[PDB]
């Protein structure tokens, strides 16, 4: 669903979906081509 | 306690609409999705369709497009579900469900369970008439009885024996359906301290047509 | 403990190049397809590292910390187990230290008194102590072994505005040349400078008589360089440009 996100201190709006890809542990987020936040780890429990 | 609501059973013929309630209570309305699962007997569950009840926009199956029709009411926190046209096939269980979203969604609540019978057959009250042996071989210490409901419509009834009393020796059959009919019988089996003290009458409920039936053995 | 051994003598400072090595994850932030430019304080490509080497030979010199250091430690029977971080190595300042007892790795800051040289079988006492550190638990063992070396192990510790920030990565393989990166591991807001540092070995007998196996590790400095990063769908650095060498 398009929502607004906070995300730790770090805004944006978008919808959530599944992560196919391999990444760090200590990851926060990542960017895309574009270099805006395209993934986002869950601050809670480890969960991208 | 978060716990969702529905009622029992619901009767509908074909080529109408029907429409059901889930009723949901302890959490905010519009925080959460709503998901319905049918329960087909022997086929195993099937999954109707998934709203959104804030934007109320609705996320349906292939299959099952133009049959249902899902809306909420955000005042009540009450979700519904609105059939069009069911058939013979459709007849069904019906779930409600809240997903909470945290990673992959799971199933945490559900509902009582509603049991739909798409039918044009009328609504009969039940004639209830015991049964009983009339005679004993003496080859055994206790002593077994039984009920017999037969004539009524639509299926599940309640059947207690002296009103819920006797909670253990106790068997519930399933209903066979004849000529837009409905029997079923229950049996009972109690030591011989018991029968000339106490007597056992057979307690049907009949939760459609609102007629409780009681008759002595 | 105060007393030093008697069988240590002197050994040169011999040089060995590093070839594409020095080059770690810059940042967390997953990258996919692009060409990334990271300005950050880098080991120049094609440069020298001085050649250490402890086997009755042994070398343990005292080198100064200006912003960074990388460490290419390649053991067999792991000879270091801590390092010696600090400024003027008494009781006066604050100096960083890494204790490794083989459960799990201490570190800690705290008024460090040193010995001129102290051995491991570090300090008479210590006291005020701003820091600690507890790490996961883990095994290794002691014991002596000479031969050839399977491993290698590659500690990164910098500087970056008081914190100090450790990247590592080990692989299976005197220094056979490559390309890798080097995951995150622990970052520690110490905030306390340092402009020395010098090698802790663990020793082994059948501080005295104490003797040692066969390893070498390597020191390396760091410069103000750019370098321009690959990034493949996995995330994983396969090559490293450095723009003012050629």
């Known amino acids: 669903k398009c929502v607004n996100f906070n995300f730790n201190g770090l805004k944006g709006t978008g919808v959530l979906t599944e992560s196919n890809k391999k990444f760090l542990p200590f990851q926060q987020f990542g960017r895309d081509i574009a270099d805006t936040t395209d993934a986002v780890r869950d601050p809670q429990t480890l969960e991208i | 306690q978060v716990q969702l609501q529905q009622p029992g059973a619901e009767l509908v013929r074909p080529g109408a609409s029907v429409k059901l309630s889930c009723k949901a209570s302890?959490?905010?309305?519009?925080?959460?999705?709503m998901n319905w699962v049918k329960q087909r007997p022997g086929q195993g569950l099937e999954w109707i369709g998934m709203?959104?009840?804030?934007?109320?926009?609705?996320r349906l199956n292939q299959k099952f497009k133009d049959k249902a029709t899902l809306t909420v009411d955000k005042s009540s926190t009450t979700a519904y579900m609105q059939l069009s046209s069911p058939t013979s096939e459709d007849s069904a269980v019906y779930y409600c469900?809240?997903?909470?979203?945290?990673?992959?969604?799971?199933?945490?609540?559900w509902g009582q369970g509603t049991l739909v019978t798409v039918s044009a057959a009328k609504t009969t009250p039940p004639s209830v008439y015991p049964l009983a042996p009339g005679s004993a071989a003496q080859t055994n210490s206790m002593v077994t009885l039984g009920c017999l409901v037969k004539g009524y419509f639509p299926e599940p009834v309640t059947v207690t024996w002296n009103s819920g009393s006797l909670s253990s020796g106790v068997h519930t059959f399933p209903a066979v359906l004849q000529s837009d009919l409905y029997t079923l019988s229950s049996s009972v089996t109690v030591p011989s301290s018991t029968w000339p003290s106490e007597t056992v009458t057979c307690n049907v409920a009949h939760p459609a047509s609102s007629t409780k039936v009681d008759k002595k053995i | 403990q105060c007393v030093n051994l008697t069988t240590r003598t002197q050994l040169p400072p011999a040089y060995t190049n590093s070839f594409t090595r020095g080059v770690y994850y810059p940042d967390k932030v997953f990258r996919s397809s692009v060409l990334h430019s990271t300005q950050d304080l880098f080991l120049p490509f094609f440069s020298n590292v001085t050649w250490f080497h402890v086997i009755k030979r042994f070398d343990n010199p005292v080198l100064p910390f200006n912003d960074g250091v990388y460490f290419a430690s390649i053991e067999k029977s792991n000879i270091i187990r801590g390092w010696i971080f600090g400024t003027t190595l008494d009781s006066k300042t604050q100096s960083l230290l890494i204790v490794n007892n083989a459960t799990n790795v201490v570190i800690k800051v705290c008024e460090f008194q040193f010995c001129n040289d102290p051995f491991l079988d570090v300090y008479s006492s210590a006291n005020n102590c701003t820091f600690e550190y507890v790490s996961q638990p883990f095994l290794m063992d002691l014991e002596g072994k000479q031969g050839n070396f399977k491993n290698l192990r590659e500690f990164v510790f910098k500087n970056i505005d008081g914190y100090f920030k450790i990247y590592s990565k080990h692989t299976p393989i005197d220094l056979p040349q490559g390309f890798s990166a080097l995951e995150p591991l622990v970052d520690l807001p110490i905030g306390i400078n340092i402009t020395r540092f010098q090698t802790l070995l663990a020793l082994h007998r059948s501080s005295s008589g104490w003797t040692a196996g066969a390893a070498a590790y390597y020191v390396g400095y760091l410069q103000p360089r750019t370098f321009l990063l690959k990034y493949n769908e996995n995330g994983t650095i396969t090559d490293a440009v450095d723009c003012a060498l050629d």
């Open positions: 709203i959104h009840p804030s934007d109320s926009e609705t």
């Open positions: 302890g959490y905010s309305f519009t925080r959460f999705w």
């Open positions: 469900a809240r997903k909470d979203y945290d990673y992959d969604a799971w199933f945490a609540y």
